[PDB]
Design an enzyme around this catalytic site. Structure first.
Site, PDB file in Angstrom:
ATOM      1  N   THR A   1       0.824  -1.203   0.000  1.00 51.80           N
ATOM      2  CA  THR A   1       0.000   0.000   0.000  1.00 51.80           C
ATOM      3  C   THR A   1       0.861   1.258   0.000  1.00 51.80           C
ATOM      4  O   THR A   1       2.079   1.188   0.162  1.00 51.80           O
ATOM      5  CB  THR A   1      -0.946   0.036   1.215  1.00 51.80           C
ATOM      6  OG1 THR A   1      -1.706  -1.176   1.269  1.00 51.80           O
ATOM      7  CG2 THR A   1      -1.895   1.221   1.115  1.00 51.80           C
ATOM      8  N   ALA A  49      -6.717  -6.010   3.988  1.00 56.00           N
ATOM      9  CA  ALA A  49      -7.762  -5.564   3.070  1.00 56.00           C
ATOM     10  C   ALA A  49      -9.167  -5.743   3.637  1.00 56.00           C
ATOM     11  O   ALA A  49      -9.937  -4.782   3.730  1.00 56.00           O
ATOM     12  CB  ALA A  49      -7.634  -6.282   1.743  1.00 56.00           C
TER      13      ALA A  49
HETATM   14  C1  3BV Z   1      -5.988 -11.505  -1.708  1.00 53.22           C
HETATM   15  C2  3BV Z   1      -5.503 -10.154  -1.602  1.00 53.22           C
HETATM   16  C3  3BV Z   1      -5.956  -9.194  -2.750  1.00 53.22           C
HETATM   17  C4  3BV Z   1      -5.730  -9.533  -0.223  1.00 53.22           C
HETATM   18  C5  3BV Z   1      -4.761  -9.975   0.853  1.00 53.22           C
HETATM   19  N1  3BV Z   1      -5.283 -11.059   1.580  1.00 53.22           N
HETATM   20  C6  3BV Z   1      -4.506 -12.095   2.027  1.00 53.22           C
HETATM   21  O1  3BV Z   1      -3.324 -12.154   1.927  1.00 53.22           O
HETATM   22  C7  3BV Z   1      -5.183 -13.217   2.715  1.00 53.22           C
HETATM   23  C8  3BV Z   1      -5.529 -12.820   4.107  1.00 53.22           C
HETATM   24  C9  3BV Z   1      -5.942 -13.978   5.008  1.00 53.22           C
HETATM   25  C10 3BV Z   1      -6.086 -13.596   6.499  1.00 53.22           C
HETATM   26  C11 3BV Z   1      -6.265 -14.594   7.438  1.00 53.22           C
HETATM   27  C12 3BV Z   1      -6.395 -14.220   8.772  1.00 53.22           C
HETATM   28  C13 3BV Z   1      -6.336 -12.866   9.128  1.00 53.22           C
HETATM   29  C14 3BV Z   1      -6.158 -11.887   8.211  1.00 53.22           C
HETATM   30  C15 3BV Z   1      -6.027 -12.271   6.860  1.00 53.22           C
HETATM   31  N2  3BV Z   1      -4.325 -14.348   2.724  1.00 53.22           N
HETATM   32  C16 3BV Z   1      -4.438 -15.279   1.575  1.00 53.22           C
HETATM   33  O2  3BV Z   1      -5.224 -15.014   0.699  1.00 53.22           O
HETATM   34  C17 3BV Z   1      -3.621 -16.540   1.440  1.00 53.22           C
HETATM   35  N3  3BV Z   1      -2.177 -16.498   1.764  1.00 53.22           N
HETATM   36  C18 3BV Z   1      -1.647 -17.684   2.353  1.00 53.22           C
HETATM   37  C19 3BV Z   1      -0.192 -17.717   2.071  1.00 53.22           C
HETATM   38  O3  3BV Z   1       0.179 -16.508   1.408  1.00 53.22           O
HETATM   39  C20 3BV Z   1      -0.146 -15.290   2.052  1.00 53.22           C
HETATM   40  C21 3BV Z   1      -1.621 -15.254   2.172  1.00 53.22           C
HETATM   41  C22 3BV Z   1      -4.394  -8.817   1.664  1.00 53.22           C
HETATM   42  O4  3BV Z   1      -5.137  -8.452   2.464  1.00 53.22           O
HETATM   43  N4  3BV Z   1      -3.144  -8.179   1.379  1.00 53.22           N
HETATM   44  C23 3BV Z   1      -2.639  -6.941   2.189  1.00 53.22           C
HETATM   45  C24 3BV Z   1      -1.311  -7.231   2.975  1.00 53.22           C
HETATM   46  C25 3BV Z   1      -1.651  -8.044   4.203  1.00 53.22           C
HETATM   47  C26 3BV Z   1      -1.992  -7.398   5.362  1.00 53.22           C
HETATM   48  C27 3BV Z   1      -2.338  -8.161   6.428  1.00 53.22           C
HETATM   49  C28 3BV Z   1      -2.351  -9.511   6.318  1.00 53.22           C
HETATM   50  C29 3BV Z   1      -2.017 -10.155   5.147  1.00 53.22           C
HETATM   51  C30 3BV Z   1      -1.667  -9.396   4.093  1.00 53.22           C
HETATM   52  C31 3BV Z   1      -2.643  -5.719   1.208  1.00 53.22           C
HETATM   53  O5  3BV Z   1      -2.707  -5.862   0.078  1.00 53.22           O
HETATM   54  N5  3BV Z   1      -2.529  -4.404   1.804  1.00 53.22           N
HETATM   55  C32 3BV Z   1      -2.481  -3.271   0.947  1.00 53.22           C
HETATM   56  C33 3BV Z   1      -3.630  -2.400   1.238  1.00 53.22           C
HETATM   57  C34 3BV Z   1      -4.948  -3.078   1.152  1.00 53.22           C
HETATM   58  C35 3BV Z   1      -6.184  -2.247   1.324  1.00 53.22           C
HETATM   59  C36 3BV Z   1      -5.076  -4.024   0.028  1.00 53.22           C
HETATM   60  C37 3BV Z   1      -1.169  -2.649   1.318  1.00 53.22           C
HETATM   61  O6  3BV Z   1      -0.716  -2.985   2.397  1.00 53.22           O
HETATM   62  C38 3BV Z   1      -0.055  -2.489   0.296  1.00 53.22           C
HETATM   63  C39 3BV Z   1      -0.424  -3.060  -1.019  1.00 53.22           C
HETATM   64  C40 3BV Z   1       1.049  -3.451   0.670  1.00 53.22           C
HETATM   65  O7  3BV Z   1       0.745  -4.802   0.808  1.00 53.22           O
END
Ligand code: 3BV
EC number: 3.4.25.1
Lengths: 201, 213, 250, 199, 234, 238, 243, 217
Positions: A1, A49
């Protein structure tokens, strides 16, 4: 992000990227990280997200109910405090969420930073996300309260761009909103690939 | 101790056309290094306008499916109308987030038609984060499927190419192609490919064959 | 079930609570109890109904309770309800002390009990407490203080008042011999002796029949003392020596 | 990381705090205020965990104000201090403990100026002068060296300046500006912010 | 002779509910008219004193941007129902990302009908029915719609309906002037006319309130000037 | 008069007056008819209107794909019971992935509605129901009363002036089992119309139809969709 | 707990308990209040002057917050309950929302509380009415009135308690733009209105005023005697030289 | 159950023309100890279905109790409706998933065989609530040993006779006895047809051990 927001004379500028990752894998590049709470209230979105989306949506619901009940529009401070209070009850449970509540208030332009950790602070400029530092650099080097509108647009857009350049987890497209007294306006939505051509040559 | 999760594999894909929506998936249910069954499609028909694809942990897939069914019925009893596609997407978001601290290990992609008859995809993460897409992949072979569709449907990284809208035929062959390619590299993808086409006429089901190794 | 309910927390057609008024009627039959506020202290004086030859007298008092190191109270009505309320008062006082590390202001304690009584008048379907209370105390906010509380949960601060049997006549009699700002503990004791003398049905008034306590400020600390029979006898005798004196002029 | 400081005089209490709100490696706010007006003559300097600080502090504050409205008079600095200490101590072994270190400054019409120190474990202790945070480790000794029970408010401000300057010299954290207020018989008075023209 | 709040009459009805229906008859009369151009709701304010600010009397409130409500009877009871309706609409928006149909809202509020009782109940549960009547006027996918609900919980759609003290007469006058093709201006005009007829006070711009919900425009409460401009062509 | 106001009070004649008073609530609503062939179950309901400007009250409700109901009495209680039945059906589908046998659902209705008739401060459900359903025992028409008693019927009518409809059905029971759908709906409509003075008859504005069967899920025909049933009927006598 | 319906409907459609509570309000000491340009005044009549009772401990005027004050009429204990709950709510509002409180909001809260007590099991309606007064941000001075039923309205001036109709009529016939054009004139209007029903005194009248961004100010009997002297002088310099 | 105690190993199932056959040894093992060598791990759930269970035997006894009670409860009504094999499978899936989600699983892996409405049913249920249908089923080591054999035949000849399926089952039990160290040469075969459910008594498996004399060459 890589979201950022700053208030100047002509309102509150809000900007963000659109990248969404699941590990190193880029899951999306078309994410609207600036939630439209009210026609006068915006909420940036960084971290988990689902967390951000759900909680800010619920915030929007609450603000609407407030608007109906009190026959008046909720203040920026009250919205940010509402969200902060909702989130605080889940402190330690693992909610990853860092948002900015921006708008125009009876006290004029309002900007608040609200954490899942429990933070809630008003301020002039703010940058939240994995690429927040990079944005902070250029934004601070180019900020002024006496910035003209197009200049502010350029500053925000460029800051998010450079952020996407350095931060591996930031990219996609720079989205830009402007919050004025009569409400907010969707300024722009330029892809990074194009902004590269524009800024380099 | 005891783990309430097990990965059962499965790949999933949805493409949105001007007047159609394709939801396809492999039919392999596996566990560890073994095959549970070769006849297990990951596609579920929700309404005449809406089809859902669910991959991952089979227990949560079944459960979430039955829940969605029940709540569709409830909505129908409550508003005397069927759930619109986007509504099912939002509902699914809330349902997924309801287990924010004990998530369904399920990757969900919803494909169907909106209220203007046009096609629409909605991609989900296991805890409710969703967005609208023209095309999206999920499940084990997701990273193998996505890049080609980015190139062929999104016309990305292609100079002086024409932006001709995706027809149902080309989309179909694209699906068959990416699944056939995925069956080569992903060990969780194989056996058979079920494709569900959604148009104004309704829902067709086709079944291509994939390798059995 | 609905038949046996006496509806204790219900408005009467005139807009009044009958159980409260009946409780007042109960209090009207209880021993006379008054209190007077002075400049150098404050005092309580109550008629004793537990006056029989065979009683053992094992307590410091009968109708005077110590609530706090800076506060004491007297009671009129059902004595057991009085026990409940006094115990609860002590509880409240100790809670405030535990929390703020300073004695509870008198009015706050009074209001605290009165909220409970009012609660008993508004919901629960229980009978109210047939008890009126007089509170005397000292605090750093309002100094010496006298209060009165009725079963209605209503209370007030007085410079001098009475509660119990023949309370009305006692009140008017206090109105007559009042002295806003010029009251001393001694003159207040004289007044108490006088009023309790005319109001108590059994005349002459022995020290056996009454009970007097005083609260005063002495060298930084608050002193609460119940007068011995001898002192009361002194006050009575003095009252007679002032009554047989004024009757000479005839 | 945050810094609090209190110096009690014969008829006044001088308090000061840093103005930095920081997260990770960046300063996110340069005008953060760590003080909470609870009475017309009572200030609460709270510092520590993310949400715990503001939550706890505001809770105490609104409860004090509630006391004022209910009773028509304000709590004494001592009563206030023991109130906050009671609340903090009660939550210590609960499900939701507040990780907060605090100072309480006040003036009573009877007892005069007062300064209180509180551990996050809710151990209340009165002191002529105190400090919280890492900066305390560099400033307390100075306060030992130069403080006298009869110190004038001018001399107290100068001493405070010595402390803050020492922070500018030895402390690795930034901390460019400081909120400074005083409390006496006339209530709370805002003073000029001690700041150092870095950049 | 006292009895339970859930006692049946020999006729087969709940006493408390019937008594609530009787309670409605003492309330300010309100009229709602459904029209393919939009729904209109008008109600008298019944100002009992010149000192009373009339703008603090709202018997027409906004449930949501597409739904408004008119109430008659014990208003204090109605406040709860209104808030419940607003909350229901917002919950539905949160969950499904869409607006509620007027019928769904009306039904939702109607579900709180006979939710009263003594024994075998919650401590905060209702002790008695709501002594109020409601008119839900709004625009959904089925176009403009008007609904009516009474303390019995029975809710039904109406093309034109009057509730309150002057219920019967105003309903007759409504039947005399309603055809399923009126323009919205005609509906407003008729409403204000019947209102002027049934009201004991002289109808003016501060005596009543009128609001409309139309397919193209949100819930709109008529201001003083607009009210005057409709009262003009009396 | 002293045994009238509580459901926990037996009369000296071995009766419970509150239950019977609750039974009287069914007769307060508009009449409704239910009949079954051998393949179809049919509910025909006469909708009632307050004024001519008010739409007609809903009388037929959807429960499950194989079960529908027709109400007679307090609409609130009707909605309650309906939601209960819906919930039980959904539970059955969730657990066993097969539709809930109608008779069992009716039994559950009996069990639920019986409870408040035995507790102080509680009251019977002021509503009568006609339940049309189809399972692998065929079509079914059931009747449930405020007294928590239920009946398995070949044909039934409940409500205001439903006696006429009952009298009609009792003559054509023998015909019912072999009728096609249209003839069945016809009979239902005649039974329903019997409960009206000759100055008024059935209309597309005041008649609702619910149909379930071996070839058809439960469907509700309300306005213009009722005309194919009304158009094809005798002129009736006077 | 006590699960018993107390407030129920009568065959004629009345809520008898609520009406009885209103009758209990009718027996209360008269309480009036008026709204001005830069001031707002509340005054309470028959304070039951016993002269042996501390006046402070029996005041019928209470502040809820720095923004809002309130007078009442009826059962004093119930009023204590309502007042305290109102104060607590005023603080909670600041806790959940950074902004303070509007007069309308706290009025709505009190009203909702009363109504809740008109519809809850085992409880009993508060036997009070309240005159709520304040100057919310934007400067607009506001006065509201509540009722045991739960109904609440806004007023330019109003009265509740014993002989409330008389003072209501007086205020109706006396509330002008000329009157309450100055602070002292508004206060004088309140004092006059109170004197039109009180047992002719001034030592029976408690008056308090809120003004602009200042705190609540209670008037000493000296100042009240002064304003009453000016009122008794204007009643002999404009009503004696014409009658 | 967090730590399984006495357990049973593989359970086999396979559809045939007009019925379904299931096999399971009669061994309850306490770790590596063949403790209870005479227990039935197959239950007759009414006349149209039947159940075989792997894993903790106590939990299986619990499910046996519960299912038996459900069947009795239904049979009391006599309303002409009964639990189909698919229905029982659905219920069992719901139950196992419910216990899984309570973090207190029933340590079992089960195979439900059935025959109703002229169709053969065979369903699999995990302790996590993973369930599915297949023409052949094998739990535990069977899934690694018996299932490959079963699939080989079923993909060369989808429809089998009862005798063919029984033979296949026998051979699979032989393989399992050879390679599974926690099995036992004493098993049971249950069968559903239109005639009902039939459980055949203690069977043994013939064993060849000639490869014992192939050490040298
Ligand atoms: C599928 C995508 C499009 C969404 C993604 N989701 C995910 O990554 C989900 C979350 C599952 C979860 C379980 C329990 C509790 C919480 C979350 N996980 C999975 O889908 C499966 N994975 C298993 C092995 O690899 C990693 C994840 C996500 O949220 N990504 C975040 C980063 C993150 C934060 C917290 C936990 C996990 C990941 C993100 O993009 N954040 C951006 C802003 C938002 C609004 C999208 C920013 O932070 C920028 C892009 C940097 O990443």
């Amino acid at each position: 992000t890589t979201t950022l927001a700053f208030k100047f004379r002509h309102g509150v500028i809000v900007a963000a990227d659109s990248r969404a990752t699941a590990g190193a894998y880029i899951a999306s590049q078309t994410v609207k990280k600036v939630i439209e709470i009210n026609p006068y209230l915006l909420g940036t979105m960084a971290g988990g997200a689902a967390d951000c989306s759900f909680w800010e949506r619920l915030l929007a619901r609450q603000c609407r109910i407030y608007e109906l009940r009190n026959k008046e529009r909720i203040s920026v401070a009250a919205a940010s405090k509402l969200l902060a209070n909702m989130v605080y009850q889940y402190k330690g449970m693992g909610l990853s969420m860092g948002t900015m509540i921006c708008g125009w208030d009876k006290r004029g332009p309002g900007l608040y930073y609200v954490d899942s950790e429990g933070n809630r602070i008003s301020g002039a400029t703010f940058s939240v996300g994995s690429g927040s530092v990079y944005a902070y650099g250029v934004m601070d080097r180019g900020y002024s309260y006496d910035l003209e509108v197009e200049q502010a647009y350029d500053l925000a857009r460029r800051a998010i761009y450079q952020a996407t350049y350095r931060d591996a987890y930031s990219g996609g497209a720079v989205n830009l909103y402007h919050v004025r007294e009569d409400g907010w306006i969707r300024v722009s939505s330029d892809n990074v690939a194009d902004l590269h051509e524009k800024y380099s040559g | 101790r005891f783990s309430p999760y097990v990965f059962n594999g499965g790949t999933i894909l949805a493409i949105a056309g001007e007047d159609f929506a394709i939801v396809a998936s492999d039919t392999r249910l596996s566990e560890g290094f073994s095959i549970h069954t070769r006849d297990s499609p990951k596609c579920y028909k929700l309404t005449d306008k809406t089809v859902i694809g669910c991959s991952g942990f089979h227990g949560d897939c079944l459960t979430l499916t039955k829940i969605i069914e029940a709540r569709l019925k409830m909505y129908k009893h409550s508003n005397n109308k069927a759930m619109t596609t986007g509504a099912i997407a939002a509902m699914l978001s809330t349902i997924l987030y309801s287990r924010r601290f004990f998530p369904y290990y399920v990757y969900n992609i919803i494909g169907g038609l909106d209220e203007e008859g046009k096609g629409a995809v909605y991609s989900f993460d296991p805890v409710g984060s969703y967005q609208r897409d023209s095309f999206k992949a999920g499940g084990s072979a997701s990273a193998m499927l996505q890049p080609l569709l980015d190139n062929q449907v999104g016309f990305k990284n292609m100079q002086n190419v024409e932006h001709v809208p995706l027809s149902l035929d080309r989309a179909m062959r694209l699906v068959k192609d990416v699944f056939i390619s995925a069956a080569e590299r992903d060990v969780y993808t194989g056996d058979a490919l079920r494709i569900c086409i959604v148009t104004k006429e309704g829902i067709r089901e086709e079944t291509v064959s994939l390798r059995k190794d | 079930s609905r038949r046996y309910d006496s509806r204790t927390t219900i408005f009467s057609p005139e807009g009044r609570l009958y159980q409260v008024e009946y409780a007042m009627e109960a209090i009207g039959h209880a021993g006379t109890c008054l209190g007077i506020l002075a400049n150098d202290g404050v005092l309580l004086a109550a008629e004793r109904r537990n006056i029989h030859k065979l009683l053992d007298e094992v307590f410091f008092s009968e109708k005077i309770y110590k609530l706090n190191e800076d506060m004491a109270c007297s009671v009129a009505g059902i004595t057991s309800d009085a026990n409940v309320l006094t115990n609860e008062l002590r509880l409240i006082a100790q809670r405030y002390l535990l929390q703020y590390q300073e004695p509870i202001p008198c009015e706050q304690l009074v209001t605290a009990l009165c909220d409970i009584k009012q609660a008993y008048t508004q919901f629960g379907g229980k009978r109210p407490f047939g008890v009126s209370l007089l509170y005397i105390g000292w605090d750093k906010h309002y100094g010496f203080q006298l209060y009165q509380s009725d079963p209605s949960g209503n209370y007030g601060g007085w410079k001098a008042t009475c509660i119990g049997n023949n309370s009305a006549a006692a009140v008017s009699m206090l109105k007559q011999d009042y002295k806003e700002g010029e009251m001393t503990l001694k003159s207040a004791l004289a007044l108490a002796i006088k009023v309790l003398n005319k109001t108590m049905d059994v005349s002459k008034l022995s020290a056996e029949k009454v009970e007097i306590a005083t609260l005063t400020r002495e060298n930084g600390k608050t002193v609460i003392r119940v007068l011995k029979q001898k002192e009361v006898e002194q006050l009575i005798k003095k009252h007679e020596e002032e009554e047989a004196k004024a009757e000479r002029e005839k | 990381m945050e810094y609090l400081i209190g110096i009690q005089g014969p008829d006044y209490v001088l308090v000061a705090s840093d103005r930095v709100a920081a997260s990770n490696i960046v300063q996110m706010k340069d005008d953060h205020d760590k003080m909470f007006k609870m009475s017309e003559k009572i200030l609460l300097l709270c510092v520590g965990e993310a949400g715990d600080t503001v939550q706890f502090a505001e809770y105490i504050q609104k409860n004090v104000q509630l006391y004022k409205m209910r009773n028509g008079y304000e709590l004494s600095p001592t009563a206030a201090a023991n109130f906050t200490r009671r609340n903090l101590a009660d939550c210590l072994r609960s499900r939701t403990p507040y990780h907060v270190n605090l100072l309480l400054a006040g003036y009573d019409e009877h007892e005069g100026p007062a300064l209180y120190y509180m551990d996050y474990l809710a151990a209340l202790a009165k002191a002529p002068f105190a400090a919280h945070g890492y900066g305390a480790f560099l400033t307390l000794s100075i306060l030992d060296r130069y403080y006298t029970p009869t110190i004038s408010r001018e001399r107290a401000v100068e001493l405070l300046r010595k402390c803050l300057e020492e922070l500018q010299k030895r402390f690795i954290l930034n901390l460019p500006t400081f909120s400074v207020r005083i409390i006496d018989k006339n209530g709370i008075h805002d003073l000029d912010n001690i700041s150092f023209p870095k950049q | 002779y006292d009895r339970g709040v859930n006692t049946f009459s020999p006729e087969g009805r709940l006493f408390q509910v019937e008594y609530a229906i009787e309670a409605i008859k003492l309330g300010s009369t309100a009229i709602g008219i459904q029209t393919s151009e939009g729904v209109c709701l008008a109600v008298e304010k019944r100002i009992t004193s010149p000192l009373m600010e009339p703008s603090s009397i709202e018997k027409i409130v906004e449930i949501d941007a597409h739904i408004g409500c008119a109430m008659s009877g014990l208003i204090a009871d109605a406040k709860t129902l209104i808030d419940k309706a607003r909350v229901e609409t917002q919950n539905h928006w949160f969950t499904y990302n869409e607006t509620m149909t007027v019928e769904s809202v009306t039904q939702a509020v109607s579900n709180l009908a006979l939710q009263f009782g003594e024994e075998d109940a919650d401590p905060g549960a209702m002790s008695r029915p709501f002594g109020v009547a409601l008119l839900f006027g709004g625009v959904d996918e089925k176009g403009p719609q008007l609904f009516h609900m009474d303390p019995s919980g029975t809710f039904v759609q109406c093309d034109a309906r009057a509730i309150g003290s002057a219920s019967e007469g105003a309903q007759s006058s409504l039947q005399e002037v309603y055809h399923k093709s009126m323009t919205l201006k005609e509906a407003i005009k008729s409403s204000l006319i019947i209102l002027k007829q049934v009201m004991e006070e002289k109808l003016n711009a501060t005596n009543i309130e009128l609001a409309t919900v139309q397919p193209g425009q949100n819930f709109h409460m008529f201001t003083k000037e607009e009210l005057e401009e409709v009262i003009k062509d009396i | 008069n002293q045994y009238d106001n509580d459901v926990t009070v037996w009369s000296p004649q071995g009766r419970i007056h509150q239950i019977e008073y609750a039974m009287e609530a069914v007769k307060q609503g508009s009449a409704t008819v239910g009949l079954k062939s051998k393949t179809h179950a049919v509910l025909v309901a006469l909708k009632r209107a307050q004024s001519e400007l008010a739409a007609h009250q809903k009388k037929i409700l959807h429960v499950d794909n194989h079960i529908g109901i027709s109400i007679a009495g307090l609409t609130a209680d009707a909605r309650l019971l309906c939601n209960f039945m819906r919930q039980e059906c959904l539970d059955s589908r969730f657990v066993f992935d097969r539709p809930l046998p109608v008779s069992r659902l009716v039994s559950l209705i009996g069990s639920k509605t019986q409870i408040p008739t035995q507790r102080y401060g509680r009251r019977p459900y002021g509503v009568g129901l006609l339940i049309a359903g189809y399972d692998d025992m065929g079509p079914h028409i059931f009747q449930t009363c405020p007294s928590a008693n239920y009946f398995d019927c070949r044909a039934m009518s409940i409500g205001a002036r439903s006696q006429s409809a009952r009298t009609y059905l009792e003559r054509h029971m023998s015909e019912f089992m072999e009728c096609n759908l249209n003839e069945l709906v016809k009979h239902g409509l005649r039974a329903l119309r019997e409960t009206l003075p000759a100055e008024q008859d059935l209309t597309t504005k005041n008649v609702s139809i619910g149909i379930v069967g071996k070839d058809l899920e439960f469907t509700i025909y309300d306005d213009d969709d009722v005309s194919p049933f009304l158009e094809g009927l005798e002129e009736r006598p006077q | 707990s006590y699960d018993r319906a107390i407030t129920v409907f009568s065959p004629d459609g009345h809520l008898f308990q609520v009406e009885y509570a209103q009758e209990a309000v009718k027996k209360g000491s008269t309480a009036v209040g008026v709204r001005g340009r830069d001031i707002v005044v509340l005054g309470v009549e028959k304070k039951s002057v016993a002269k042996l009772q501390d006046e402070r401990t029996v005041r019928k005027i209470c502040a809820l917050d720095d923004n809002v004050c309130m007078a009442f009429a009826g059962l004093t204990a119930d009023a204590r309950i309502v007042i305290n709950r109102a104060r607590v709510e005023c603080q909670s509002h600041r806790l959940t929302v950074e902004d303070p409180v509007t007069v309308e909001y706290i009025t709505r809260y009190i009203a909702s509380l009363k109504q809740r007590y008109t519809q809850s099991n085992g409880r009993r309606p508060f036997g009070i009415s309240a005159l709520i007064v304040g100057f919310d941000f934007d400067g607009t001075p506001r006065l509201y009135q509540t009722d045991p039923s739960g109904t609440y309205h806004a007023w330019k001036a109003n009265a509740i308690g014993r002989g409330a109709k008389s003072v209501r009529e007086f205020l109706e016939k006396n509330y002008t733009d000329e009157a309450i054009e100055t602070d002292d004139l508004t206060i004088k209007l309140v004092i006059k209105a109170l004197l039109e029903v009180v047992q002719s005194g001034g030592k029976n009248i408690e008056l308090a005023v809120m003004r602009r961004d200042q705190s609540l100010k209670i008037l000493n009997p000296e100042e009240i005697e002064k304003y009453v002297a000016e009122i008794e002088k204007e009643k002999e310099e404009n009503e004696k030289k014409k009658q | 159950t967090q730590n399984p105690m006495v357990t049973g190993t593989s359970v086999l199932g396979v559809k045939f023309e007009g019925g379904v056959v299931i096999a399971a040894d009669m061994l309850g093992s306490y770790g590596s100890l063949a403790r209870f060598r005479n227990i039935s791990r197959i239950m007759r759930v009414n006349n149209s279905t039947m159940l075989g269970a792997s894993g903790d035997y106590a939990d299986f006894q619990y499910l046996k109790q519960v299912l038996g009670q459900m069947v009795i409860d239904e049979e009391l009504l006599g309303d002409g409706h009964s639990y189909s094999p698919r229905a029982i499978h659905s219920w069992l899936t719901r139950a196992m998933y419910s216990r899984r989600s309570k973090m207190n699983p029933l340590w079992n892996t089960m195979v439900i065989g059935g025959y109703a409405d002229g169709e053969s049913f065979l369903g699999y249920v995990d302790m996590l609530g993973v369930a599915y249908e297949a023409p052949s089923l094998a739990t535990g080591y069977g899934a690694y040993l018996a299932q490959p054999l079963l699939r080989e035949v079923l993909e060369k000849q989808p429809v089998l006779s009862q005798t063919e399926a029984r033979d296949l089952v026998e051979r699979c039990m032989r393989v399992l006895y050879y390679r599974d160290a926690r099995s036992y040469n004493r098993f049971q075969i249950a069968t559903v047809t239109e005639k009902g459910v039939e459980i055949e008594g203690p069977l043994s498996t013939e064993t060849n051990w000639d490869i014992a004399h192939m050490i040298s060459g």
